[PDB]
């Protein structure tokens, strides 16, 4: 809170550290609060949104994980292939075909082509 009061622009690591904690504890809207900061400080949110999304799955905040990823990836935000494999499998593990299918559709929009692994995850709940 004192960083903006002084006027010093916080570091890239500074925002990275906090979003890891908020995702780890389960903060839903708190992570987005920081995401607005780099939207004003000329900093890309890709790394921060990637670690925030991944951390939310590392705890049992499955509903939070889909909301954060879908909101960020609805616009232009390429994601690493590891994240795509994680959420498609994780959503299908708990029975979230609606969330999994949307991510798979979103994944194919950004170049990456769904292979047999993604189809196998979907077929688990469709069976």
């Amino acid at each position: 809170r004192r960083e903006l009061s002084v006027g010093l622009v916080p570091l890239h690591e500074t925002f990275v550290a906090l979003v890891r904690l908020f995702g780890s504890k389960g903060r839903a809207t708190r992570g987005l609060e920081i995401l607005a900061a780099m939207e004003k400080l000329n900093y890309d949110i890709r790394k921060a949104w990637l670690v925030l999304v991944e951390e939310l799955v590392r705890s049992n905040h499955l509903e939070d994980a889909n909301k954060v990823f879908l909101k960020g990836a609805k616009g232009g935000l390429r994601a690493t292939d590891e994240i795509y494999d994680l959420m498609i499998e994780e959503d299908c593990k708990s029975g979230d075909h609606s969330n999994a299918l949307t991510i798979a559709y979103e994944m194919e929009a950004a170049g990456r082509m769904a292979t047999t692994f993604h189809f196998n995850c979907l077929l688990s709940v469709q069976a």
Partner: protein, 49 residues
């Protein structure tokens, strides 16, 4: 390339009498049903009502 799935359906079969009764019978607040259509009164010999 996952295609745009679209599952539509159209069934057909004989109806149970209970299905017809639920289709047609309308129960007034007073408790009457009167869905039988007892009389073959097409139109009044009087005004065409």
């Amino acid at each position: 390339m996952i295609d745009q799935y679209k599952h539509q359906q159209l069934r057909i079969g004989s109806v149970s009498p209970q299905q017809i009764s639920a289709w047609a019978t309308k129960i007034l607040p007073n408790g009457e049903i009167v869905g039988e259509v007892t009389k073959p009164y097409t139109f009044h010999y009087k005004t065409n009502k």
